[PDB]
Antibody, heavy 214, light 207 residues
Framework: QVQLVQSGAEVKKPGESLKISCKVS????????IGWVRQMPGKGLEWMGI????????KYSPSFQGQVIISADKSINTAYLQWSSLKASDTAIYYC???????????????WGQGTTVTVSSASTKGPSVFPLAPAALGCLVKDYFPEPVTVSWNSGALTSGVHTFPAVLQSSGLYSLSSVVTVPSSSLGTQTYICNVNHKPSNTKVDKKVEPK | DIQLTQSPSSLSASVGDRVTITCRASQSIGSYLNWYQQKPGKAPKLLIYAASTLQSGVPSRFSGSGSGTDFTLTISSLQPEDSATYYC?????????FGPGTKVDIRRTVAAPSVFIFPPSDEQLKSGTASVVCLLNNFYPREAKVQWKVDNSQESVTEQDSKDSTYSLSSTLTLSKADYEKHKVYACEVTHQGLSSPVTKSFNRGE
């Protein structure tokens, strides 16, 4: 029943500051270590550091010490990860993960958060434009947005089988674009309602689009 | 600072195969080692802690062993949902460095792409641009060739499906409204080894 819910994706210009927060429920928050894992684009996992929220004792990797701050507010079951000035190379996905202990104890990260996508760019945020892919297979074309990521669902998550959301491609315009499709029986094209729910946190934009055949 | 190496960096095996991945530390770490599984677009999952101790909820086909410098992760019977990236981690001393990771793909029978095509929306046209999409659904292997002929494109490809181990590809042909209005027939040709002959899916403007 333990679940960690991290804050939404963000976009910041280089030099700016940033605090990302993970909210923890399900267990005694002040009893177990919590850590931050960093994953650069197309790269493996990096162990950044951990904090015991009980006494705010922190243990960094030497590669992040003085570059980043790990803190915790045990009054609201929340941990934080903070930068003074963001570098371009700080662009990554940042995971929050409880470091449980097992019977010089045996430490391991058993529970993880969904993650927080951080994009460091001088480019300004753009919300997406959503067009229908009229049909059997049907979909939604999400175009001209910045920066990653968007998330697409169908019928508020009620439609999962046969859904395929493609990795975004970077158009020459410097904007992203991706499509999400689903396959459904051709008999349901006139009897069922198909809506894609596109969600772009960096632009505070959420789009619902109903797809109809031509 | 402890360094970790895993081998192989990537492997492909068919359903039912026995697969072993190895982790090697720069120093002796006894049994202080963990294994994690990360499926594409998802957050990582604890599989094994203390070198051999299986995490609750994890399927019995996963097993781990080793001590000192060399550890192994073993999947007794590969499932199609087991196609994921696998990391090791040392829990002896901070920092708790991870391993480089190993990509595990799945080998299946050759499947041919179901090919669809979507003409641009009338809403999109009034915005200035025109994007034509060709979709290749549930095929294998990942290699495939798409060509747009009318008589400036971009492709994307999903990861291996966790249920049927197939891939899926999209190709988006993008023009300006002016250039789109100047031609009649749009078609995508698809060559694949599961296809005995090239498949062409086309449309004429207007319906």
């Amino acid at each position: 029943q333990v679940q960690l819910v991290q804050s939404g994706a963000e976009v910041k210009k280089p030099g700016e500051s940033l605090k990302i927060s993970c909210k923890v429920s399900g267990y005694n928050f002040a009893s177990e270590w919590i850590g931050w894992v960093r994953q650069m684009p197309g790269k493996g996992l990096e162990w950044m550091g951990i904090i015991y929220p009980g006494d705010s004792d922190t243990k960094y990797s030497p590669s992040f010490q003085g570059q980043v701050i790990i803190s915790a507010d045990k009054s609201i079951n929340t941990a934080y990860l903070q930068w003074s000035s963001l570098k371009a190379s700080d662009t990554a996905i940042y995971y929050c993960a409880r470091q449980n202990h097992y019977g010089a104890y045996y430490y391991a990260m058993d529970v993880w958060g969904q993650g927080t996508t951080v994009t460091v760019s001088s480019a300004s945020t753009k919300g997406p434009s959503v067009f229908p892919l009229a049909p059997a297979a049907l979909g939604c074309l999400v175009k001209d947005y910045f920066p990653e990521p968007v998330t697409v669902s169908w019928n508020s998550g009620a439609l999962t089988s046969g859904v395929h959301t493609f990795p975004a491609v970077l158009q020459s315009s410097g904007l992203y674009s991706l499509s999400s499709v689903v396959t459904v029986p051709s008999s349901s094209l006139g009897t069922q309602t198909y809506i894609c729910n596109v969600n772009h946190k960096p632009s505070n934009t959420k789009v619902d689009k109903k797809v109809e055949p031509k | 600072d402890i360094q970790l190496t895993q081998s192989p960096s990537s492997l492909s095996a068919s359903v039912g195969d026995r697969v072993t991945i190895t982790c090697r530390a720069s120093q002796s770490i006894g049994s202080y080692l963990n294994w994690y599984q990360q499926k594409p677009g998802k957050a990582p999952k604890l599989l094994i802690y203390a070198a051999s101790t299986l995490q609750s909820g994890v399927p019995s086909r996963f097993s781990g062993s080793g001590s000192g410098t060399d550890f192994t992760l073993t999947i007794s019977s590969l499932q199609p949902e087991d196609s994921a990236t696998y990391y090791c981690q040392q829990s002896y001393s901070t920092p708790f460095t991870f391993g480089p990771g190993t990509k595990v793909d799945i080998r299946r029978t050759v499947a041919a792409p179901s090919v669809f095509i979507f003409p641009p929306s009338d809403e999109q046209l009034k915005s200035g641009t025109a994007s034509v999409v060709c979709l290749l659904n549930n095929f294998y292997p990942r290699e495939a060739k798409v060509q747009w002929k009318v008589d400036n494109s971009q492709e994307s490809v999903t990861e291996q499906d966790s249920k049927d181990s197939t891939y899926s590809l999209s190709s988006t042909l993008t023009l300006s409204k002016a250039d789109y209005e100047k031609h009649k027939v749009y078609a995508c040709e698809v060559t694949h080894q599961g296809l005995s002959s090239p498949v062409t899916k086309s449309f004429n403007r207007g319906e």
